[PDB]
Symmetry: C3
Subunit: 253 residues, 3 copies
């Protein structure tokens, strides 16, 4: 880093020390249990556009995105292009029930090339997980040997550190994949907030608030990430946004 | 109240006392834990029409309604008016990602002026809550200082008492708001049904059953409320429906 | 059954005994807690087509399907046929708010005649339940006397045994019905995985993965069932698919 001489007032510089306190509040308020956490799944489309599934939640997040939800210009598990009563054009059916569909092309170009998953806040980094599952949301072809997570679940340092508050990972997808994501609040020290008398609040306060937002180009995705103070990895593989606050920003450039 | 002379049969008037018992059953059966509770969010539209998000649930309710779900004539987070691939007409995008959208008008007239939230049953009135959050479902502009609820969450006597079984509140909205609602079953005396061996049932039995119903005019909303036995506040600010049962109805008019 | 003479190698027939072990793994891996379970609701339409709500989940499943979700060619609670701003054509409204709608026919032929519900895996068979509820998801006309389940909830041996791993039931529906389904993991012996320190995982790992798949004819439904290794009852009332694995298939035909 590049730093050099600086001056400040003496004991009377409470304005500066107050701003230092504020910087620390922004950086540690997320660790007060039942503070919000934020997880965003950014689908990267062939078209150069992107779509964010943006979740804010205070305790835990259980996400499954199926094939149609992942498509460009959908906002739910509903595809306006594809009237399911028509005999032709059933690409989704052809993928989830092999050789019983009728898509007009091998690769529906609305299906994403991959997702950037951004985890932010007081997350339990040891159990934060992503999986590219098959069409059914399974991590084994045979459900009878599938489990909550697969033997090679995406986790640990596959989630790139982006600051004390954030990690992000890029997950390539092929056309038969779906996406699962898990994040929970960090263990509350030696107390388990999912245990005993603490559970009711942890469970019932957990209103997950999802939004699906589209972006016409990555510049706009990156702007969204800096607006929302969340980690993001751009097309160049660089970490261009973070949840960590610095009192003078990137002043040691 | 207006009451006057009445007669009844003597010890043989079991029909009357049976009906008195039935009145009490309707009024107290909701307090038997794992009985249904009922919460309804009525969106009031500029058009004079309304839309109800009607939830019945036996243990707890965690609701977040985002911008598109709140729009007149939507039934999910999907807006048929707005094809998200078009460059023009992205009003939702303009609100949730400031100055990256293209709505055709400053105020999409399908967005509601406010909601009437109706809580009914054995609800924990001390932790029944509503918030008009921002587009992301946050109660602070900066998620890093946002929490499960805001410092000024709508609660307590902002929820108007409408009988022993019900409360209702009117919540004005501006166009960038979304709505969150929490209701849980009242503490089970000194036992916590969210604790220990009671939790499995409390958790897994809690199938929340949502319906989205539209009403062309308030007369029809009020009818729906009386059909469903739930509190409702009409345009005049009057409580015109309740969950409380009376053996002769409003006979002391 | 028809069986007759067979031979095998002696102590060196490890290939056979390995395949016997594999058969047993497929049959008992589902009993390792947090293994996947699979529940499918197959709607049978007047048109001879079917639609599957296919859920895989590791711990519990809480399903409510409302009227519009049940309709042929819907994939969410959204009906493209019916623009809710139009005065005519509101069949759903006419059912859920009696005599306030305007459907074009008494019976919307997209509404199913019944559902086949298929339960598979380490399910608690004593508390696996289905209900055909009314439009609101209630099992009593008056919610104040409704409960999490009705006095005549569909359960026990109404769920037909289809093997050690599976049961299935046919549930007739009339046009004002909706469908509720509950399945949970079997009690973990004398330990309760929904209790104490076990709960956090049981709760947060439970990502339910739903897909809605259509089938143009029952032959294709039956194929889907055999692909997915789940119980299914065909139009003839026969059990034509199962989760149970046999080392030589149905070799005692």
């Amino acid at each position: 880093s590049t730093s050099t001489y600086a001056l400040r007032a003496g004991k009377r510089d409470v304005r500066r020390e107050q701003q230092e306190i504020i910087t620390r509040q922004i950086n540690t308020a997320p660790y007060v249990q039942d503070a919000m956490m934020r997880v965003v799944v950014f689908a990267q489309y062939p078209s150069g556009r992107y779509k964010a599934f943006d979740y804010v939640f205070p305790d835990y997040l259980k996400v499954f995105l199926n094939w149609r939800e992942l498509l460009e210009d959908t906002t739910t598990d509903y595809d306006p292009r594809t009237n399911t009563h028509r005999l032709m054009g059933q690409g989704y059916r052809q993928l989830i029930h092999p050789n019983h569909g009728s898509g007009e092309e091998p690769y529906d170009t609305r299906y994403p090339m991959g997702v950037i998953v951004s985890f932010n806040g007081n997350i339990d980094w040891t159990r934060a997980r992503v999986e590219a599952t098959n069409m059914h949301g399974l991590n084994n072809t045979d459900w009878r040997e599938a489990r909550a997570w697969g033997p090679h679940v995406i986790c640990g340092n596959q989630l790139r550190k982006a600051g004390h508050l954030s990690r992000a990972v890029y997950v390539p997808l092929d056309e038969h994949n779906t996406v699962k994501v898990l994040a929970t609040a960090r263990q509350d020290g030696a107390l388990n907030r999912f245990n005993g008398p603490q559970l009711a609040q942890t469970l019932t306060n957990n209103i997950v608030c999802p939004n699906v937002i589209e972006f016409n180009t990555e510049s706009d995705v990156i702007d969204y990430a800096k607006m929302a103070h969340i980690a993001y990895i751009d097309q160049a593989g660089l970490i261009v946004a973070s949840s960590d606050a610095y009192i003078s920003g990137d002043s040691q450039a």
